[PDB]
């Protein structure tokens, strides 16, 4: 017989290591495979799917009235509408998103994000909007005249019904804002209603990565 000796660490039981196991029912055939569509292999195929977010982050908004904002013609002129803090681990507009609910499991994240807005008013209505992005090293501009210094884009519903905004990436180490401003007053015809709507989407790009897995604090 071959001689041997036990290392320290014998007989212990880890919970993460993988080893072969003794079968319960040897020489038992399982039912074979079949090509079922929609097979996913990596979880980064999930987070690249776009999803709605909660733009209207004000209080007293219950249910499916948190997904839209109102822009009435008679109300507001040169007024900011909304802003998104880019803190996924923190609560806010991005908590109930598909990129949010996955990345609560992991604790280190890095990757470029993409936001897509969508207008939902009538055919006739026009008007312009600007979307100022602010890096974390700068403060969020609350006035329009300082907001033209940062990276912004002039969006015109009318000519275009949607818009794509690329966020430069930054890792999560221990914050960035995407804000809006009403450029001109909304003009609608006499027959259509005055109130219009906006919806914001979000989806990570393909350089989005996750490192260390932990339990989630989201569910009790």
């Amino acid at each position: 017989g071959v001689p041997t000796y036990l290392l320290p660490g014998s007989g212990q039981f880890l919970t993460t290591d993988d080893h072969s196991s003794a079968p319960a029912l040897p020489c038992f055939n399982p039912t074979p495979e079949m090509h079922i569509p929609g097979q996913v292999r990596n979880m980064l195929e999930v987070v690249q799917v776009e999803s709605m977010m909660e733009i209207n982050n004000t209080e007293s908004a219950v249910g499916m009235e948190r997904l839209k904002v109102d822009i009435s013609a008679l109300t507001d002129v040169d007024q900011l509408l909304f802003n998104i803090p880019l803190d996924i681990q923190l609560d806010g507009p991005l908590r109930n998103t598909l990129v949010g609910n996955i990345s609560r499991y992991y604790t280190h994240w890095s990757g470029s994000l993409e936001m897509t807005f969508m207008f939902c008013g009538s055919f006739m209505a026009t008007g312009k909007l600007i979307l100022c992005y602010t890096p974390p090293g700068g403060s969020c501009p609350t006035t329009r005249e300082t907001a033209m210094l940062g990276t912004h884009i002039v969006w015109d519903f009318g000519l275009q019904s949607s818009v794509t905004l690329i966020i430069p990436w930054i890792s999560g180490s221990h914050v960035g804002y995407v804000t809006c401003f009403m450029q001109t007053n909304l003009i609608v015809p006499s027959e259509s209603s005055d109130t219009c709507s906006l919806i914001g989407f979000i989806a990570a790009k393909d350089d989005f990565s996750l490192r260390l897995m932990r339990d989630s604090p989201d569910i009790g």
């Binding site: 007989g11 212990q12 039981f13 919970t15 993460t16 993988d18 196991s21 003794a22 079968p23 319960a24 029912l25 038992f28 399982p30 039912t31 074979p32 495979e33 079949m34 079922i36 569509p37 929609g38 097979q39 996913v40 292999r41 990596n42 979880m43 980064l44 999930v46 109930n96 598909l98 609910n101 992991y106 990565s209 996750l210 490192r211 897995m213 339990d215 989630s216 989201d218 569910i219 009790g220």
Partner: protein, 187 residues
């Protein structure tokens, strides 16, 4: 990235059952995986999946006692008294292990008659809502094998499950409201 694969995403090896018994005398636990809400929510994300069990039974007592752990698949009879003649049957997987040894380990292969487990079943059986008769696996009955010593025993059993060889299909949005029961998905 080797981290975020589905075979690595569901291989946590968490606890599922922990119920002691004092010296009815034997422990019978159904194999339904909807025990803890931590593991249950991670299985809500997929429609159909396919795996194997890798049960580990850890046993501590408050003494050279011997334990029998028998696995019973669906369709076969389950024992009701400790010394019943179902325990003597050899048409089912049994393991005999002591306390002083390192804990027992046994894996249970994929035993649905379909191609995958149906986590969600929008349909009825016979005539129940949300019960697929090909979904359930069986149950493991754990008794002791000794004449009882008339002293203070407290035998506590813990069962762990590492689902490996995972394949997944049709990702689904997660659940945000807390559970009402374990039979269905009320809120």
């Amino acid at each position: 990235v080797s981290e975020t694969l589905v075979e690595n995403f569901l291989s946590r090896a968490a606890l599922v059952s922990k119920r002691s018994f004092e010296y009815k005398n034997f422990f019978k636990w159904t194999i339904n995986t909807r025990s803890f809400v931590q593991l249950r929510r991670k299985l809500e994300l997929f429609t159909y999946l396919r795996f194997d069990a890798e049960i580990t039974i850890l046993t501590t007592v408050a003494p050279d006692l011997t334990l029998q752990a028998m696995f019973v698949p669906t369709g076969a009879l389950t024992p009701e008294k400790q010394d019943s003649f179902h325990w003597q049957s050899g048409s089912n997987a049994s393991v005999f292990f002591k306390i002083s040894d390192p804990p027992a380990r046994i894996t249970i292969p994929f035993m649905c008659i379909n191609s995958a487990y149906s986590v969600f079943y929008d349909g009825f059986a016979g005539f129940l809502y949300g019960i697929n008769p090909a979904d359930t696996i069986g149950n493991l009955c754990v008794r002791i094998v000794n004449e009882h010593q008339p002293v203070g025993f407290t035998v506590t059993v813990r069962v762990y499950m590492k689902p490996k060889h995972i394949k997944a299909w049709a990702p689904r949005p997660p659940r945000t409201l807390p559970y009402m029961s374990i039979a269905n998905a009320n809120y």
